[PDB]
Amino acid sequence: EMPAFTAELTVPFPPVGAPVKFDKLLYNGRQNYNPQTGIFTCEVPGVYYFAYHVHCKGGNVWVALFKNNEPMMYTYDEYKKGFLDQASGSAVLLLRPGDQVFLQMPSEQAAGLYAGQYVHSSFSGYLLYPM
Amino acid sequence: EMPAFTAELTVPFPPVGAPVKFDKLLYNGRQNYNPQTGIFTCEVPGVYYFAYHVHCKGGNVWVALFKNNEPMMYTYDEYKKGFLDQASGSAVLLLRPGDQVFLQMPSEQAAGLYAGQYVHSSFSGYLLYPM
Amino acid sequence: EMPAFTAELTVPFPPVGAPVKFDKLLYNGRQNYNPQTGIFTCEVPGVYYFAYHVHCKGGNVWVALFKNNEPMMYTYDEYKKGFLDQASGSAVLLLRPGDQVFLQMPSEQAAGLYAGQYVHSSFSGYLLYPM
C-alpha cells in the first residue's frame, strides 16, 4: 500500500491547541494516519499533498496545517452571523521520516470549527513522489 | 492513458436525487467521466482522489460524494441572504472496476447548487496508485 | 526531482490584470514555479493538477486559472459585507513544454482578493502523469 488517507470530523467544536481528531476514515493506506490522535506520521520519505476543509459556525475559526511544531499554512474564517460557512486549504510538503502532520486551532478566540453527522469537515493526505 | 478529469457545471440548479451532470470538460483521460451521467466509472483499479467545489445561491445546498450507493462525504452550506457562496470537499477512495463516484443532492430542501458561464461549480478526480 | 509546488500570499489585494504573485513557498520541485511572477512554467510534459484557495474581503473576487492566454476555470465570490470569506478551485490540465499556468483577476470591479500573515490565499500544482 501507498500512504494516503481521508478522515472526517462529525462532531462540532473539537479541542483547541491539539490536533483535530478526524476519526471517520474513508481510506488509510499503510495506516500512517491515526484517528485516535489526528496525526499523520511519515513512514515513506517524499513529497506529499495534504488538503483540509473546515466548516465555521458560532465563532471565527483559525486553523494551521502543522509539520511538527511549524505552521505551514494558515486558514482563517469569520463566522457569518447565524449561518454555516466553510474554508479550505491544501499544500505540497516535503516530508522526512518521522515528521508529524496535522491540523490544529492555535487560538481559543477562534475555535468555531464546525462539523456534524451530515456536515463533514475533513483532512486528507497522500504521497506524490518517494524521495 | 491514465484516468483523470475535471468537469464544470455551467447551468444552475441540477435535479435532486440524481448524479450532478457537470457538462464542461477541461480534461477527461480515458473518458471515465461521462458528462451525460455525471458519473465517474472506475476502469483501472486503484486509489483515487476526488475534489469538488459547489456554489450556493438562492437556497441551502446539501451534497454528498457517493461511491456506488454509499454516501462517503457530506458537504453543506447555507445560503447567505442574497450573496453567492461556495463550499468544497475532497476525498481519497480505493476503487474497483465498475465502482461509480459522483456528487448528488439528497434533499429538495437544500438544492441551491448554483453555476454559471463565469461561475463554475466543478468535480475532478484522478488515479493515484494502480491496485 | 518532480515538478510540484505550493506558494502562499501573505499581503492583501494583489494587482488586477497580472498574475497573482504568491511568494511564500512551501515546496518548489524543479523550481518550475516562479515567486517573482506567480507563473508556473511547464518543463516536464504531462497531466497536472492545480488547486487554489483565495480569500475575499472588502470587495467581490473574480479570478481565473489561466493556461497561457486562455481562461480555463473561473472562480467568483461575493464579499460578505464585514466578514472575510473564501472560495477555491481545482483543475486537471494537460500541459506541453513552455505552457504557463497562473491565477489572475480580470476586473477592477472584483479585486477583493485578501491575505495576511495569519491567513494564506494559495496556489498549488504538481505533475500527475508524464507524457
Curated annotation (Swiss-Prot), chains A, B, C:
Chain spans, region Nonhelical region (NC1): 1-131
Taxonomic superkingdom: Eukaryota
Domain named C1q: residues: 1-131
Protein name as annotated: Vastatin
Annotated source species: Mus musculus (Mouse)
Gene from which the chain derives: Col8a1
Segment of the intact protein contained: 614 to 744 of 744
